[PDB]
């Protein structure tokens, strides 16, 4: 249950930031000595709560969905990925033409979009593409911006390799994406250049 | 990655209730037509946020911790289990004498306490015991109250059996607890009586 626990640790870490923020915000509201910050506290509760909703709507499909056969609308996927990009620096350029997407496609695309975002820790553009053609659905996310970089744990996860030294959270997501694309019969590919990275997957459709 | 995804689905489902509540609460604050409920809305945001913190502090150790060697204080565990019992009907009677507990003991006890609570869907007492003796640490939770009941999915999970028809959320927790107690070298036992159930585990210590 080592894999499962690492994924749970990931989820907990992402949710804990905005949840702590709400708590803090409300502590400030009640503290008779911080009345100078009432409005910033109230804004922080509102925004954190929105951040949490966005992260939970996303995590339910990206991580929580089952292997079971089910189509999603790509517009709804755009919406989930847009929600997660709202709370980090890079911008999202979603280019999948609206259409229904099978379940591996859908779990795959959401994960790919976020790995692309977290490859851009000083901003940039994550361009998301996805075409149904030739008995497949083929996804590619291009991340572009300063110091764009797939960390080593991400790359080892995307190849299904154990985690060496590097962070569990980035890894578990990448390995999870690898395992689900392999169980589906497809393949992961990566490109790395100067100020750029891209992550690609195909799956049968 | 089927097991991992089910655990993620569990986590998401538990967190989504109070997070939606906060969102709703704040929608009521802003809605110029529900000003009649301003105080109940504000109370609901405060309480939901507290519920979330309690669930996240608990989930980080119950689910998120690694197999890696690490002691916890039982008082701190009491605190985590108390937090989760705050948001359901049954009451908790923690009887572990304060002492350090190894990692399998600790993941085990937290899970056992909550399974005991969710066995009491119309209230009652979950009594939690835990003794270090004879090269072991041995935990038992007794749930007592009307219609106390280990559901079939819980029992199949506690034995490591696949999930048949029954709910994924109760199951995944029980299987996760089984896998971690087995990887540690210990065993799970269950008792079932009228208006009572108990779940027990030992692990080497
Ligand atoms: Mg996440
Ligand atoms: Mg939970
Ligand atoms: Ni577009
Ligand atoms: Ni006590």
Author numbering:
A (entry chain A), B (entry chain A): 21 to 225
Give sentences copied directly from the paper behind this entry.
At the core of this circuit resides CtrA, a response regulator that is able to bind DNA and act as a transcription factor, activating and repressing many essential genes involved in crucial cell-cycle steps such as cell division, DNA replication and the development of polar structures. ChpT does not belong to any class of known HPTs. We have demonstrated in this work that His6-ChpT, an essential phosphotransferase that controls the phosphorylation of CtrA in C. crescentus, adopts the class I histidine kinase fold, with a four-helix bundle flanked by two domains displaying a structurally different ATPase fold.
Each subunit consists of two distinct domains, an N-terminal helical hairpin domain and a C-terminal α/β domain, which are connected by a short linker (residues 84–91). The dimer interface is exclusively between the two helical hairpin domains and the twofold symmetry axis runs parallel to the helices such that the N-termini are adjacent, forming a four-helix bundle referred to as the dimerization and phosphotransfer (DHp) domain. The DHp domain contains the two H-boxes, with each catalytic His33 located on an opposite face of the four-helix bundle. In His6-ChpT the ATP lid is substituted by two additional turns in the N-­terminal part of helix α5. These turns occupy the space in which the β- and γ-phosphates are usually located in the CA domain of HKs. Also, there is an additional short α-­helix (α4′) between strand β5 and helix α5 in ChpT, which together with the latter helix closes the ATP-binding pocket found in the CA domain of HKs.
